[PDB]
Amino acid sequence: EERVYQLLPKGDVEGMRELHQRGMSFSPYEPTGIYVKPDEEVVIQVEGTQQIKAYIGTYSYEKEGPKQFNLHPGENKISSSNGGLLYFYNYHNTGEVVAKVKKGGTPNPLFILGKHTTKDWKRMLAENPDPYAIEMKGENSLLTMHPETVAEHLKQEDPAALLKKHDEIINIEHKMSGLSKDGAGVANQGKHSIHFVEDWYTDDYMYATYYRTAYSKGNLESVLNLEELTNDGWGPWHEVGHQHQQDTWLWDGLGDVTVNIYSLAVQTTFGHKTRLEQEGRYEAAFAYLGKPDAQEKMNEFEKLVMFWQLHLAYGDQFYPNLHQMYRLLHDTELPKSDEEKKQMFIYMTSKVAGQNLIPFFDKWGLSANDATREKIEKLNLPKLEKEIWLSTDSNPIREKQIELYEAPYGEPNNEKIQNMVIGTTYDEEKAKELVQNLGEGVKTTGVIMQDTPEVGEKTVKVEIVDGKGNKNFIPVVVNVGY
C-alpha cells in the first residue's frame, strides 16, 4: 500500500535551544508508525522543492543510537543495519513537505491525540499484536514505550487522557520559562515536542539529554499511569524541567536545584503541597540563614528554597520575565564563570523584581560584590519592605506582584536565506532586511548575535526594539560564511 505524510515546517531544534539558552534540545522526531526491520530497504519519495532529514531507530530505546539520513527531493531509498522505527524531520521554518512511503516498512501502533478514537486504539492494538513499540503522540509530547509496559500501566481505555496531561505539564513548564506557542523570539516555545522513552539498556534511574527524556525498565509508572503522573509524577516533571533549565544562571551546585523550580510549578498548579514543605526543607535551610559559608554547607534541596521564594513574592510572572531577560543578553554581558553567574543573578532578579534584592541574597549566603552593588544602585530600585527570606508555602510573605514582559513582535525573512560574514555583531542595513512584520513603533537596532560562531546554514539572532525601550531577538536563518 502507501502511507503518505504531510510534514509541517517545525524548524531547527538546535536553533531554538540556543535562543532559549537551554542545555539540551527538544525532539526533532515526527512519528510515522512504521517499523523498519534490520537490513531492510525503504522507498520514500519527497514531493516538493525542499529537502528533509530522516531517522531509523529511537533515541534511548535501543542499545545502538539511531541512524540519521539526508533525504534529497524525489524518490529516495535508504536502509539501516540495526533497523527501528521511522521518523522524519522537516527542519525548515516554512513550506510543508510531502513524504510518502510506498515500499518497505511494517505497521507499528501510533496513537495520535485529537485524531484517533478509542475504536482506532482498540483496532490499532488488535491489528498489531506484540509490536516492536507503542507510540503515543500528543500536542507537545511523544511517548515511545514497550507494549507490555503500556499494558501494565495504562489505566484508561485509550492514551488520550494521558497525552492531555503530559501536554498540560509541558505547557506549564513552557509558561514558567516565559515560552508560548504564539510568542515572538525569546517568547516562542518553538514547534518541537518533548520525547519520553522507555530505556531497557541503561542503569540510570531517570535522565534527560539531547532530543529526549528517558526512563529505565521498571520505572515507567509515573509516566504511563495517569493518576501517578498527576499525584506522584515528580520524576517526569524533573526530567522535563531539565530540558528547560537555562545555563546562564546555572553555576556549579545548581545542576539538581533550579531544575526543580519547574517541578514545584507543576506540583502547585495541580493543587498539591510543595516537596520542600512536606520534607521540612524550610526549617533545615533556615539553620544556615545568616551563615557566612551557608551556600557551601547546604544541600541541593535546601538551596531550592530561596529560588521558590522569589516566585511566591512577585507572582507567576517573575520567572517568565527572568528567562526572557536572560535571553536578551548581548555577547559581552553573558556570564562566563560560576562567580559571574552568581553576581549576574543578583542583578537580573533585582531588575525583574523592580527592587533591591541584595539583602535577600545576603541572608542566603550569596553576597554581591562592589561592582554588582554599584550596578544595582544605579537602577534606583526601591528597598525591600518585607522579609521575604522567611517565606514558605505555608507562609506567603509576598511583595508587589509584577506584570508580564511584553516583547516586541517580529518575524524571520523566510522568503530568502541571506548572506552574512561570520563575526558580524552590528550591521544596520542587513539586519533590517532579515526580519518581517514588525509591531507598531518597532524597529531593528542593527545588533546581530550568533551564539555559536559557526559557518553555514545556521540560526542567528536579530535585535528589535519598541518605543518603550523593550527589546527582542528574532531568530533568522542565514548563510554564514568566511
d(CA 351, CA 80): 53
Q: For the chain, what percentages of helix, strand and coil (3-state, to nearest 5) are there? A: 35, 25, 40
| Number of neighbouring beta carbons within 10 Å of residue 214 | 22
User: Partners of 296 in the beta sheet?
Assistant: none
The span from the CA of 5 to the CA of 44, in Å, is: 10
Which of residues 404, 425, 446 is at a domain's end?
404
For 94, the grid coordinates are 516554512
Residue 418's CATH number: 2.60.40.3600
Same domain, 236 and 250: no
Q: Indicate the DSSP class of residue 253.
A: T
Query: How many Cβ atoms from other residues are within 10 Å of residue 231's Cβ?
Result: 13
Give me the helices (H) in 74-159, please.
Answer: 118-127, 147-153
Residues 285 and 338 both lie in one domain: yes
Domain count of the fold of the chain: 4
Cell 503500556: give the residue: 150
139 and 102: one domain?
no
Residues 193 and 315 in one domain: no
Listed resolution, Å: 2.4
| 44, 48, 464 from 72: Cα distances, Å | 10, 10, 35
- For the chain, helix (H) and strand (E) counts, in that order, are 17, 21
Would you say the C-alpha torsion 282, 283, 289, 295 has a positive or negative sign?
negative
Same-domain check for residues 21 and 90: yes
> Does one domain contain both 87 and 151?
no
What range defines the domain where residue 448 resides? 405-482
Tell me, yes or no, whether 249 and 390 share the same domain: yes
Which amino acid is located at 39 in the chain? D
Q: How far apart are CA 463 and CA 449, in angstroms?
A: 8
Q: In degrees rounded to 5, what are phi and psi of residue 270? A: -90, 10
Same domain, 337 and 361: yes
348 and 409 belong to one structural domain: no
Beta strand extents in 113-201 (DSSP E only): 134-137, 141-145, 194-199
Q: What's the CATH number where 264 sits?
A: 1.10.390.30
What does the block give as the cell for 216?
A: 529505565
CATH label of the domain that carries residue 234: 3.40.390.80
Say which amino acid occupies 211: Y
Contact yes or no for 42/105 (Cβ under 8 A): yes
Residue pair 193/142 in contact by the 8 Å Cβ criterion: yes
- H or E segment to which residue 357 belongs: none
252 and 196 belong to one structural domain? no
Claim to verify: residue 222 and residue 317 sit in the same structural domain = no
Cross-strand partners of 84: 36
194 bridge partner residues: 141
CATH number of the domain encompassing residue 63: 2.60.120.1250
Length of the chain: 482
Provide the terminal-to-terminal Cα distance of the chain, rounded to the nearest Å.
48
- Please identify, among 77, 109, 141, the residue that sits at the C-terminal boundary of a domain: 109
| Whether residue 314 sits in one domain with residue 288 | yes
Measured CA angle at 177 (ends 171, 180), to 5 deg: 50
Alpha helices in 34-136 (DSSP H): 118-127
How far, CA to CA in Å, does 216 sit from each of 49, 193, 196, 245? 41, 21, 11, 22
Name the residue among 217, 224, 216 with its Cα closest to residue 155: 224
Q: Which of 371, 404, 437 represents a domain boundary (last residue)?
A: 404
Burial 100-130 (b: 16+ CB within 10 A, else e): ebeebbeebbbbbbeebeeeebeebbeebee
Residue 169 CA to residue 230 CA, distance in Å, equals 9
